[PDB]
Structure formats: structure tokens, C-alpha cells
A = this chain, B = another copy of it.
Amino acid sequence: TFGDVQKQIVNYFTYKAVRTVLHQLYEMNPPQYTWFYNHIITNRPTDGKRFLRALGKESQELAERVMITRLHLYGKWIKKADHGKIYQEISDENLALMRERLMET
């Protein structure tokens, strides 16, 4: 069961797309940056689908921008991701944490 994993990853990319959009507004549209920032306080980019649904009810344009961005970002990641390398880096990190233990000796 890795349904939880797929969901958490989509949540994270939704989150990352929110930050990307806020960064664009900060530079290019300061009144909307303020609006969106304030919106996010009460509607947290936690669960991606719930977040997007509530955002959409107040601003379809910002919801669509987050949607497009999250999908684009996910597409760029998977073209690049080396999962075998990540597995190896976990194994490397496990062994490194064990070594730290010997140091406290």
C-alpha cells in the first residue's frame, strides 16, 4: 500500500506550485500576492485537492495557475528523477547515521 505516498507527493507538488505562484505575484502582481498570501493563512496547501477546490471558489485564475504549475513541475521531476540513486542515498545515509553513533563512544 503506497496510495498514501502518491497522495503525499501530489500534495507536495501542489505546495511547491503554490510557492512558485506566490513568487511570481510577489514580483509581477503585488495586490494579488497580498490577496493570495492572506488566503493561504485560512486555506492551507495541505491536502492538494481540498486546497484547490476552496481556492477555485474564490479565484479560478489562481487555482488554474496552481494546477498548471503543479502538473508542469511534476512532469519536469519525473523526466529527471533517478529513483535507484535515491534508494542508494538512503542506504548511504543509514550507514552514515550508524557511523555517527560510534563517534559518541
Contact = CB atoms under 8 A, between A and B. Distances in A.
A28 interface: no
Contact of A71 (B12, B77, B91): B91
A78 B104 CA distance: 34
A94 B71 contact: yes
Given A83-B81, A87-B78, A56 B97 contact: yes
This chain: how many copies in the complex? 2
Contact of A98 (B67, B87, B89, B94): B67
Nearest to A67: B94
| In the A-B complex, the 9 residue pairs with the closest CB atoms | A67-B94, A78-B83, A2-B77, A71-B90, A56-B101, A8-B12, A52-B97, A74-B87, A60-B101
